[PDB]
Write a protein that binds this ligand. Structure first.
Ligand SMILES: [Ca+2]
Length: 223
């Protein structure tokens, strides 16, 4: 996250770190046994880390649970990033409390102008590299579809939205991928892609979760 603020320990209780020896992507806990992330975060050998603030220090609220199954969306396209969504089943259920909690799926899509919270452990610089150890947060609005398409001609599908600031300076970045965009207490987006970080006229692009609720629910019910 570029241009954000330190969230505070366990203030974003649905935020996950995906670990394969190191943090590589975020995710969101949607019930005691399932996480949603980006398909471009797929790899084998995932450990899901819940209850994290500092990802390099054991602080006492963590739960570390291996994945048993990963399911990439059937229509994910790695070239265009259309349908950039994945489900991960945990080997055992997490223990839910005030610091480790699920986030609700949306019943309706959010409109442009809605303010959302984006979080992650990604790079905090737009030029150069500095990775934080504690969770960072950013408040940002959903942008109109017209502004999004004008920023990325030919690249925005109906399964994507833009959020952020056209003036630049505040955005998600490398290492935030897969993490949550929460608006009015519901998971509306997944950190997906952009051109660089925090550049003028190049806001972040997010997977539009409201288009996937039926697939999520049916997949969880049968796996
Ligand atoms: Ca920790």
């Amino acid at each position: 996250i570029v241009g954000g603020y330190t969230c505070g320990a366990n203030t974003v209780p649905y935020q996950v770190s995906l670990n394969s020896g190191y943090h590589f992507c975020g995710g969101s806990l949607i019930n005691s046994q399932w996480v949603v992330s980006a398909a471009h975060c797929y790899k084998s050998g995932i450990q899901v880390r819940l209850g994290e603030d500092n990802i390099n220090v054991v602080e006492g609220n963590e739960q570390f649970i291996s994945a048993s199954k990963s399911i990439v969306h059937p229509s994910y396209n790695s070239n265009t990033l259309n349908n950039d969504i994945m489900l991960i089943k945990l080997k055992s259920a997490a223990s839910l409390n005030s610091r480790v909690a699920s986030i609700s799926l949306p019943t309706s899509c959010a409109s442009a102008g809605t303010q959302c919270l984006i979080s992650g452990w990604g790079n905090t610089k737009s030029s150069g590299t500095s990775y934080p150890d504690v969770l960072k947060c950013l408040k940002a609005p959903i942008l109109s579809d017209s502004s999004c398409k004008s920023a990325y001609p030919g690249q925005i599908t109906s399964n994507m939205f833009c959020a952020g600031y056209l003036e630049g300076g505040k955005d998600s970045c490398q290492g935030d991928s897969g993490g949550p965009v929460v608006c009015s207490g519901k998971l509306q987006g997944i950190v997906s892609w952009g051109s660089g970080c925090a550049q003028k006229n190049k806001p972040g692009v997010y997977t539009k979760v409201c288009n996937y609720v039926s697939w999520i629910k049916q997949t969880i019910a049968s796996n």
